[PDB]
Amino acid sequence: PKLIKNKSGKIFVETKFSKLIGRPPLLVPGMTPCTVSPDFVAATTNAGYTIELAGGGYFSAAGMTAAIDSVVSQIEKGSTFGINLIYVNPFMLQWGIPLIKELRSKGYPIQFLTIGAGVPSLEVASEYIETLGLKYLGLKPG
Amino acid sequence: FTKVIDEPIKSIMDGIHDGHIKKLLHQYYGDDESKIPAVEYFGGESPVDSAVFKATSSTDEESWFKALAGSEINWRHASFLCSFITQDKMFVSNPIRKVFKPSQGMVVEISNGNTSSKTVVTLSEPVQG
DSSP states (O other), X not given: OEEEEOTTOOEEEEOHHHXXXXXXXXXXXXXXXXXXXXXXXXXXXXXXXXXXXXXXXXXXXXXXXXXXXXXXXXXXXXXXXXXXEESSOXXXXXXXXXXXXXXXHTTOOEEEXXXXXXXXXXXXXXXXXXXXXXXXXXXXXX | OOOOTTOOHHHHHHHHHHHHHHHHHHHHSTTOGGGSOBOSOOOOOOOOOOEEEEOOSSOOHHHHHHHHHOSSOSHHHHHHHOXXXXXXXXXXXOHHHHHTOOXXXXXXXXXXXXXXXXXXXXXXXXXXX
């Protein structure tokens, strides 16, 4: 680990992850029900830290889309956040992966996707990495 | 470690990060902030004074953009290496990178490379011969 500062004088804990994301290497993981709330996602993002919107608290592309729009309206220009999807329920993925692709095509500030409760197969992971157009992929091996 | 109720998330995360900063300072920087290196901005790095550059049909895109960006972290670095730019609140492909995408006949002239405040990057292409 190393220390680094920017022009403003803000100290940063320099790390591989921190070097990539330009923020302190501390993240709040996707938690259903704690991070389902757009207000908490916004408050964490605006504090300067990474957080994942929990897909476990939404049951359709429309509900998650409304939540994402709320988050975007609540954050400052240039901020970003992630989304957490559970790999055990195929319905969640089936409506969520196309939603992420669509929102990223529209340019929505979705930095990364974290897949919880299981690791995708090679083909599914390649599809995610290629089509979703995200900065990085989060995985939670058990 | 969960005891204080209704502590703002800003406070919790800042406390953790500042603890790490203070311990790192005392351990590896002699409790001196002047030892900490400074950059224009922090981020965008993948985990993995006068000059003229010329493109061909085989110029490697990455090396081309690395040469255009330079070594110092500054506005030019971001302009030629940042993958996205920020619209109002959205993220779109960096237009500067696509405008400078190398192809045969493109000649990029960099002037005042060292002084970023006055660096000017000029792209010239064959027009009308």
